[PDB]
Design a protein around this nucleic acid. Structure first.
Lengths: 100, 142, 185, 144, 55, 66, 75, 141
RNA sequence: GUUAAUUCCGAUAACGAACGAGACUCUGGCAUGCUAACUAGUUACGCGACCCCGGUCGGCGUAACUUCUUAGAGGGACAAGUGGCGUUCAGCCACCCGAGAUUGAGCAAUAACAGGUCUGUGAUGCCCUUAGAUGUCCGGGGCUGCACGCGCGCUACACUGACUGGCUCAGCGUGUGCCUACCCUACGCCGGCAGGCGCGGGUAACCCGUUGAACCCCAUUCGUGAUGGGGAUCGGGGAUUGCAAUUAUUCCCCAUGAACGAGGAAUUCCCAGUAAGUGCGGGUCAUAAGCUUGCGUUGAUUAAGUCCCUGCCCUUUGUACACA
C-alpha cells in the first residue's frame, strides 16, 4: 500500500510540471500523500579539449549535464497508482514505480 | 514552562555553526566540550570576546550548545564566534526588551562586523590554463 | 574587562605617539586594539582601508613570507606574542610603545625615484610600510641560519630600532637610503 | 651528572671507523657503514641501553656487548626485515653486515654480474643508470 | 594452425581492446559513464547526447 | 562603470511618455508599475529601466527635459 | 669557512660560570645561553631543566620551540 | 561529576597511559619495541611505551564514536606519505598494530565487538574513563 | 565631456537602422517567509550506560518542525538616498541603511591567416601500393637509448625547520561496464609492510562516509655540522596487476648517502578569500599522477596610477610599402 514514485529528469520546469500534476492528481483522488522529496542534483562534468589536434592554446570545455531526482510516496493500492501514472506522461521525466 | 529554544546559524565559506540557546545556568559548550579546550588554543580570547565584552551576568542565565560541521579550524572558530553572538542577539530580541538588544548590537557593531555579518567571500574557481583562480602557467618564448 | 581591552596582558592605553605625522596611520589607540592580532580579512579591499588595520596585525601579516611560511597566521601570532614577551623582559616598558618608537625611528623620511635619480619625500603610510618591511627583513636575515630564534631576532631588531644605536638592519638600510637620497639630489 | 665524567672518549674505535663522541649514540652508530638510523634504534632498543646519553659516557664492556649484538643479529632477537642481505647468494644466511663486508659483497655482486655478462653488469661497467632511468636529460655533472 | 594463431592475443585489457564507437580508433577515448567514444566525436554529438556548456 | 544603454533609455522614455500619470517618485512603486505595464523578460533589465525612470522623474522635478 | 666549536657537556669553569653569571642575566633563554657559553642548545635546555629543578630561575611562558626563563624576584 | 570533554585530552591520554603502566596486564606483543607504526612513518618512536598511550587514544576515540574497525583506525592514524623526490600524499596507518590494540582491549574488558562490525566501549571502560577524568580534574584543581 | 565599451549627453548633411559590446544563461553568499522531506537533521521525551539535582552519548525509538541539509517558485540592487564635482545632461567620488554599491565562467561582430589536424572518421578529391602488400595477424625490439643545450613541472638548500606521539577540521566528486573479459569497499583473522582469506552493503543523500585529508595546535629529541635538511645513485629481499617486468611496471623493508649554503644576464604570473603553502576527487588506469581539470584548508605584501618598456584602439600628418 506504500507505493513509491521516483521521478528522474534532465529538464527543470518539465519535472516541476510533472510533479505538480501528480500532486494535483493525488489531491483530487483524496489519499494520504507525503510531500515531494528533492534528492540533490548531479552535475555530470566532462572536461575535454576544444581542438581536435593538440596545436594551439590549451583550451578546455566544461560539458555539464544536470540531472534531478524527486520521490513521492503514496498510501494507496496499485490500481490507483497505475491509473495516475498512466496519464499525462512526457519524455523529459522517467518514472519508476516501486510497490514495496 | 514555555521552551525558549533559539536556533541561530552562522556561516563561514564552508563552516556553518548553529548555536542553540535556552533558559538555564551559565555554561557554554561546543559539541559537548566547553570553550577551554578547542584547538588551536591561541584563539581562546577570540572565543571569550563576547563574554569579556558583555559580562558574565548576560551569559549566566543562557546555556549554549553548538553543533558544528564544515570548514577548517579558523573557519569553525569564527563560525561559533559569530553564531553564539547572533544567537544571543536573537534571544534578547525575542524574549526580553528590544532596548538591551539594541545596545548589545551597538556594542558588537562598534567592535567588529564579524560578530553579526557573515563574510560573502568564497573560493574563486580555478580556470583552465592556470594552477589557480588568477595565476597562469609559465609562458616560454622561443 | 568590559571597559578596557587587554591585548593579551597588555593595556590599550599608555601609548605615546610622539610623531604627529603618524597619529592617523598608527591604529593602536582606543578603536582598533584587540585581544589578539589575528583576524579574518577585508582590510586590503579599498585603497586607504589598509591604514585602518592595526600595526600588530600588519606585522603579523608581513612576517609570513618566502613560500614555505605563507599561510601560517596563528604561527606568526605565536611569534609576535613571544617576541613581545622578550621585548618586555629585556626593556621593561610597553612592547607596543617599543614597536611604535621602532617605527618612528626606523621609517625613512626621504627616498630616491626616477622621473639619474632624484630624491623626494614619502607618504607617511608609505613610511610605515617601508619601516615594517625593513624590520621584518632584518629579523628574517638575523634568524636565517642562526641558533637565535625568530622571536629573539624580531625582539632584538625592534629594541635596536627603538634605541637607534645603528645596530638594527632596518636602521642600517634607513641610513643607507638616506645617504643615497642625499647623494642623488 | 651532566658534567664531563672521567674516561670520556672523544674518538671511539668501533669496527675500523672513527666515531665522534660529541654526537648522541643512536646517530653516532650511524657513521659506521652498513648501519643506519632505524637499525641503530632497533639495536639500542633491543639492548637495555638508555639512549639519552652521549657517545662518551658508555663503558668498554658495554660497547663490546654492543659490538657482539651488532655482529650477531639473529641471536639477540632482531627479526629478518632489518637485514640488508636477506637470502644471500653464497652462504644463504640472514645477517646484517658491517662496513667492510658491505662493500665486499657489493663488489662481489658486481663481479658476478661482470662474470655472467648481463645487461645490468654491462650498464655498471659502462657507468650508466641501471634501474631504468632516463639519461637524455639528466646525468651531466658526472660525465665532463 | 592459422585459426590457432589468428586470435591468440589476450584482449582482456589495455587501450587497444577498447576503441571508439564511431571512429573505432584507439586515441582520446572517453570511457567515462560508458560513452566509449573519442573526444572529437563527443564534441560533435554532445548536443545530441545532452551535454551542454552551461558554465 | 554604471552607464545605461539605448535599449534601457529609449524604452524608459516611451514608458514615461505613455504612462506619466501612473509613474511617481518612489522606486519600489514605479518599478512594479513598469513591471505591470511593460513586458520585461528579466529583473536586471527591469531594474535598469525603473532606475532610469526614477532619474528622469528627478530631472522632471528639477526642471524641463528636452 | 667557520665552524662552531660548541661544548657538549659541562666543564668545571663553564659550570661555575653558568652557576654565577647566568642567573644574573635578564634573558635566560637557551639560544642566548649557547651563544654566550659556547655550548649546545640542547645542553642549554638541559641546564635550564636542571635550574628549574634546583629553583634559581623563574619560568615565564613555555613552548615546544622556545622556553623563556628569567631571574628571581627582587622583593 | 565531569566527563572527558571537560578534561584536557593531551594530559588525559598520558594519565591513562600511566594507568596502564600501573595495571600492566594488557598482554603486549613481542614485536612492539621493533616495529614502525605506519608505512609512511620514518623513525622508531622516542618513547618506549607508546603502545599504552596509543591504547589510551584508542579508548578515548572509541568513547567519542563507535563502530571504528581496523580501516577507521588506519584512517585516524594515517598521515603524510613523503615519497621523496615525488610530492607527498596521504597514507593510512598500519593495520596490525591497531589490531593488536583491539585484541588487547578484547582480552581484558575495555571494549566489545558490536553488531554490523565495529568496536563499542563497555560500561566498565566508561566507568574507568570517567574515574580517571575525575582524577585529572582533581589534579588540575 | 563620460564610460570596461561606436556607452550615452550634446553639436552636426544627415535620417532610419543592423552585428558586437551591453543585454543573456549558469555559478556564490541575503531569506528564522512559501513548498517539501524515514535515502538529512533539530527540539522535547521513553529508556540504557557512566561521573558527583546536573553533564555527555553518530546507543536505540517516537510528538512536531526545517534553523543546520537539499532543490523549486520567488524576492533582493537599481547609482536607490544624501553631500560634493561636472553644460547641471551624459556621468564620477565618499557615506547612512544595508549580505553584496565593480564575483567568475560560457556565447562572443565583418574580414583574413597559404597557422594545426588527410595520424578522429566507412568526411573526401589527386598521386602511390595492392599478394614477396604501404591490407591484416603473430613473436621480439624500439618510441625510455646519451660527451650536449633548451622548455614546462616536482623536491630541497633548513631551527619560521626535521623526527616522534596526542588532538582536530571539507567539497567538487567517482563507484558492478552491449563487445567488456576489468567497480567502490565496511568488518574479523594471518603478517612489520605491500597484501591474502571470508561473509556483508551499495546501480548510489541508503554502503564506503558524520567522507576522522594535509599545513596548522600542543609536548620531548636535535643545535648551525652538508647535521636528524635533502633523497639522487646503488645492492639484497618480500607482494600486488598482467599471457609476458629484462631496460628495475607499481608498492613496502634494510643499507649505501652525491650535488644543493637563496642561484648571473635575462625572464613568468598576480593585486582579495587573490598570489602562495597544503592536501583530496575525475581523465589517462588491468597495474599508475612527478601531468591536466575541478574542490577544500591556511591565507598575505604592495597598488587603485602610467605610457617609461612591450603592445592595442581613435584623430592628424608623411610615404618612393601594398607577398604592406
Amino acid at each position: 500500500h506504500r507505493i513509491r514514485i521516483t521521478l528522474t529528469s534532465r529538464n527543470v520546469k518539465s519535472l516541476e510540471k510533472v510533479c505538480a500534476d501528480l500532486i494535483r492528481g493525488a489531491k483530487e483522488k483524496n489519499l494520504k500523500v507525503k510531500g515531494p522529496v528533492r534528492m540533490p542534483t548531479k552535475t555530470l562534468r566532462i572536461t575535454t579539449r576544444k581542438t581536435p589536434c593538440g596545436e594551439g592554446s590549451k583550451t578546455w570545455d566544461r560539458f555539464q549535464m544536470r540531472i534531478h531526482k524527486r520521490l513521492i510516496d503514496l498510501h494507496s493500492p496499485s490500481e490507483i497508482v497505475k491509473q495516475i501514472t498512466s496519464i499525462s506522461i512526457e519524455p523529459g521525466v522517467e518514472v519508476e514505480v516501486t510497490i514495496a | 514552562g514555555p521552551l525558549q529554544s533559539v536556533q541561530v546559524f552562522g556561516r563561514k565559506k564552508t563552516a556553518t555553526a548553529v548555536a542553540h540557546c535556552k533558559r538555564g545556568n551559565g555554561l557554554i559548550k561546543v559539541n559537548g566540550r566547553p570553550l577551554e579546550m578547542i584547538e588551536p588554543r591561541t584563539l581562546q580570547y577570540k572565543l571569550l570576546e563576547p563574554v569579556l565584552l558583555l559580562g558574565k551576568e548576560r551569559f549566566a542565565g543562557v546555556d549554549i550548545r553548538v553543533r558544528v560541521k564544515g570548514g577548517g579550524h579558523v573557519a569553525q572558530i569564527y563560525a561559533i564566534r559569530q553564531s553564539i553572538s547572533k544567537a544571543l542577539v536573537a534571544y534578547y530580541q525575542k524574549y526580553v526588551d528590544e532596548a538591551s538588544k539594541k545596545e548589545i548590537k551597538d556594542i558588537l557593531i562598534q567592535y567588529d562586523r564579524t560578530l553579526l555579518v557573515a563574510d560573502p567571500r568564497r573560493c574563486e574557481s580555478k580556470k583552465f590554463g592556470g594552477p589557480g583562480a588568477r595565476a597562469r602557467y609559465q609562458k616560454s618564448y622561443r | 574587562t568590559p571597559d578596557i581591552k587587554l591585548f593579551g596582558k597588555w593595556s590599550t592605553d599608555d601609548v605615546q605617539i610622539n610623531d604627529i605625522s603618524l597619529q592617523d596611520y598608527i591604529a593602536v589607540k582606543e578603536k582598533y586594539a584587540k585581544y589578539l592580532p589575528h583576524s579574518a580579512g577585508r582590510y586590503a579591499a579599498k585603497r586607504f582601508r589598509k591604514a585602518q588595520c592595526p600595526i600588530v596585525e600588519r606585522l603579523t601579516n608581513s612576517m609570513m613570507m618566502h613560500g614555505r611560511n605563507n599561510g601560517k597566521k596563528l604561527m606568526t601570532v605565536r611569534i609576535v606574542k613571544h617576541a613581545f614577551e622578550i621585548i618586555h623582559l629585556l626593556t621593561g616598558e610597553n612592547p607596543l610603545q617599543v614597536l611604535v618608537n621602532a617605527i618612528i625611528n626606523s621609517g625613512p623620511r626621504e627616498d630616491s625615484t626616477r622621473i639619474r635619480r632624484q630624491a623626494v619625500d614619502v607618504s607617511p603610510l608609505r613610511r610605515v610600510n617601508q619601516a615594517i618591511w625593513l624590520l621584518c627583513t632584518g629579523a628574517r636575515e638575523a634568524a636565517f641560519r642562526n641558533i637565535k630564534t625568530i622571536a629573539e631576532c624580531l625582539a632584538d631588531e625592534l629594541i635596536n630600532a627603538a634605541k637607534g644605536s645603528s645596530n638594527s638592519y632596518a636602521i642600517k638600510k634607513k641610513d643607507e637610503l638616506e645617504r643615497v637620497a642625499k647623494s642623488n639630489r | 651528572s651532566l658534567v664531563i665524567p672521567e674516561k670520556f672518549q672523544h674518538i671511539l674505535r668501533v669496527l675500523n671507523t672513527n666515531i665522534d663522541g660529541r654526537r648522541k649514540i643512536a646517530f653516532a652508530i650511524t657513521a659506521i657503514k652498513g648501519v643506519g638510523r632505524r637499525y641503530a634504534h632497533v639495536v639500542l632498543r633491543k639492548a637495555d641501553i638508555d639512549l639519552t646519553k652521549r657517545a662518551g659516557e658508555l663503558t668498554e664492556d658495554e660497547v663490546e656487548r654492543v659490538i657482539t649484538i651488532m655482529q650477531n643479529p639473529r641471536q639477540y632477537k632482531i627479526p629478518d626485515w632489518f637485514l640488508n642481505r636477506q637470502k644471500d647468494v653464497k652462504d644463504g644466511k640472514y645477517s646484517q653486515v658491517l662496513a667492510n663486508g658491505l662493500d665486499n659483497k657489493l663488489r662481489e655482486d658486481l663481479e658476478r654480474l661482470k662474470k655472467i655478462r648481463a645487461h645490468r653488469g654491462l650498464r655498471h661497467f659502462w657507468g650508466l643508470r641501471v634501474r631504468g632511468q632516463h639519461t637524455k636529460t639528466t646525468g651531466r655533472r658526472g660525465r665532463t | 594452425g592459422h585459426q590457432q594463431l589468428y586470435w591468440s592475443h589476450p584482449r582482456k585489457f589495455g587501450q587497444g581492446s577498447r576503441s571508439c564507437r564511431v571512429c573505432s580508433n584507439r586515441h582520446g577515448l572517453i570511457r567515462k559513464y560508458g560513452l566509449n567514444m573519442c573526444r572529437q566525436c563527443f564534441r560533435q554529438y554532445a548536443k545530441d547526447i545532452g551535454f551542454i556548456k552551461l558554465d | 562603470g554604471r552607464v545605461r544603454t539605448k535599449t534601457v533609455k529609449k524604452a524608459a522614455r516611451v514608458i514615461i511618455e505613455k504612462y506619466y500619470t501612473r509613474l511617481g517618485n518612489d522606486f519600489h512603486t514605479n518599478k512594479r508599475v513598469c513591471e505591470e505595464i511593460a513586458i520585461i523578460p528579466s529583473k536586471k533589465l527591469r531594474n535598469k529601466i525603473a532606475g532610469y525612470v526614477t532619474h528622469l522623474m528627478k530631472r522632471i522635478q528639477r526642471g524641463p527635459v528636452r | 669557512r667557520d665552524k662552531l666549536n660548541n661544548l657538549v657537556l659541562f666543564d668545571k669553569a663553564t659550570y661555575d660560570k653558568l652557576c654565577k653569571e647566568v642567573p644574573n642575566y635578564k634573558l635566560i633563554t637557551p639560544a642566548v645561553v649557547s651563544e654566550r657559553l659556547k655550548i649546545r642548545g640542547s645542553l642549554a635546555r638541559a641546564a635550564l631543566q636542571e635550574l628549574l629543578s634546583k629553583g634559581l630561575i623563574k619560568l615565564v611562558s613555555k613552548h615546544r620551540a622556545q622556553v623563556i626563563y628569567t631571574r628571581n624576584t627582587k622583593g | 561529576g565531569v566527563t572527558v570533554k571537560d578534561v584536557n585530552q593531551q594530559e588525559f591520554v598520558r594519565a591513562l597511559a600511566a594507568f596502564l603502566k600501573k595495571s600492566g596486564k594488557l598482554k603486549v606483543p613481542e614485536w612492539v619495541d621493533t616495529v614502525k607504526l605506519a608505512k609512511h612513518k620514518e623513525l622508531a618512536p622516542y618513547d618506549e611505551n607508546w603502545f599504552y598511550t596509543r591504547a589510551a587514544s584508542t579508548a578515548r576515540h572509541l568513547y567519542l564514536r563507535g563502530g571504528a574497525g581496523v580501516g577507521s583506525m588506519t584512517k585516524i592514524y594515517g598521515g603524510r606519505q613523503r615519497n621523496g623526490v615525488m610530492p607527498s600524499h596521504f597514507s593510512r596507518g598500519s593495520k596490525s598494530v591497531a589490531r593488536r590494540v583491539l585484541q588487547a582491549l578484547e582480552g581484558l574488558k575495555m571494549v566489545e565487538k558490536d553488531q554490523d562490525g565495529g568496536r563499542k566501549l563497555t560500561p566498565q571502560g566508561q566507568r574507568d574513563l570517567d574515574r580517571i577524568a575525575g582524577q585529572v580534574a582533581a589534579a588540575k584543581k
